[PDB]
């Protein structure tokens, strides 16, 4: 619980894939990237696999994945609960 425990600390990209393959579509993990220190990544169970998005940022502190921008990560997550996170399939975030 709150702070440490809304990201899975110490988890690799492929570990996230391993965990999420055991879950249904739309389930997800937010993690600190190892490949790009100082980035956050969102791993998301799709129909047949697990795919990864990079949390994009600007100089004003906004958060984004595609084009809609948000003043927090939490707001970004909530937006992708009801708008698809994928541009090819319908994938809503669930927890």
């Amino acid at each position: 619980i709150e702070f440490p425990e809304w990201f899975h600390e110490g988890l690799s990209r492929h570990q996230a894939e391993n965990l999420l393959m055991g879950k249904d579509i739309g389930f997800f993990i937010i993690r600190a990237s190892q490949s790009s220190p100082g980035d956050f990544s969102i791993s998301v169970r799709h129909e047949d696999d697990v795919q990864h998005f990079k949390v994009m940022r600007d100089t004003k502190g906004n958060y984004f994945l595609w084009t809609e921008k948000f003043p927090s990560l939490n707001k970004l997550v909530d937006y992708y609960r009801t708008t698809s996170i994928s541009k090819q399939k319908q994938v809503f975030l669930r927890d």
């Binding site: 990209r13 490949s35 990544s41 990864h52 990079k54 994945l65 595609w66 996170i85």
Partner: peptide, 6 residues
Amino acid sequence: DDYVNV
């Protein structure tokens, strides 16, 4: 590495 949105 490879990201859906990159």
